[PDB]
Amino acid sequence: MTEYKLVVVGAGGVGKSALTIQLIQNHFVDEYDPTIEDSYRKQVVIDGETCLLDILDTAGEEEYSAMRDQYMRTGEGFLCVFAINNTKSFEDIHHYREQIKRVKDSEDVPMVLVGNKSDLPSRTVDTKQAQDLARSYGIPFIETSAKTRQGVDDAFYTLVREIRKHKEK
Ligand SMILES: Nc1nc2c(ncn2[C@@H]2O[C@H](COP(=O)(O)OP(=O)(O)CP(=O)(O)O)[C@@H](O)[C@H]2O)c(=O)[nH]1
Ligand SMILES: [Mg+2]
């Protein structure tokens, strides 16, 4: 009944779609399918409010288009996703944050840093590295596994709460 527009961004391969599908389907999509839907709706009660989440699951490597920016500009909050076994994707968070600041023309956009694939061994990005980056940005850091669902609902609900901290809903 209250709509929240959420946008999921991050490098190609970090699990943006798998995260969204876990929230939507309670299932782990184990293969890469480039034709998967990118626009989802999820109705859930968060702190006693009935929330209709309108989720845009973006393409990580899509190049500039006015249309791409226009779709992102509708977002009220952003999940910025890297994978904990993908150092480049972690470093690339700088690019996605700058992109969001530009598209929204704002330094205070609701945002959660998400470190996905926590089910995997020998991670290459330590939790303390991610905590430090999120601290530098003034945003929460949440670790997730789209495979097990660990942290997935936390990431989306925390983003909803970050939006409420920024604007009346
Ligand atoms: N072990 C594990 N694998 C995952 C996890 N999340 C996604 N993957 C796997 O990573 C690969 C890429 O997942 P996908 O969700 O398509 O990534 P994406 O970020 O949406 C790719 P694009 O930006 O091109 O749309 C898939 O093989 C998928 O199953 C995870 O939490 N754990
Ligand atoms: Mg995807």
32 CA from centroid of ligand 1 (Å): 7
SS3 111: strand
**Which residue do the tokens 């996703």 mark?**
81
- Which of 100, 13, 93 is CA-nearest to residue 60? 13
Residues lining ligand 1, CB < 6 A? 12-18, 29-32, 59-60, 116-117, 119-120, 145-147
Q: Which one of the ligands is nearest to 117 CA?
A: 1
Ligand 1: residue whose CA is nearest its atom 8: 15
| The ligand 1 atom nearest the CA atom of 120 | 1
Alpha helices in 87-151 (DSSP H): 87-91, 93-104, 127-137
Residues 124 and 136: their CA atoms lie apart, in Å, by 20
Point out which residues pair with 55 in neighbouring strands: 6, 40
- Provide the residue type at 96 as one letter: Y
Query: Domain count of the chain?
Result: 1
Residues 112 and 134: their CA atoms lie apart, in Å, by 8
Structural domain boundaries, residue 39: 2-165
- The gap from C-alpha 52 to its chain's centroid, in whole angstroms, comes to 17
Of 7, 9, 16, 123, best ligand 1 pocket probe by most atoms within 8 Å of the beta carbon: 16
The H or E element spanning position 153 is: helix 152-166
Residues 101 and 104: their CA atoms lie apart, in Å, by 5
Residues 104 and 125: their CA atoms lie apart, in Å, by 28
* Chain breaks in the chain following residues, C–N > 2.5 Å: none
Residue 47 belongs to a domain with what CATH number?
Answer: 3.40.50.300
Alpha helices in 41-92 (DSSP H): 66-73, 87-91
Instruction: Please give the backbone phi and psi of residue 10, each rounded to the nearest 5 degrees, phi first.
Output: 145, 170
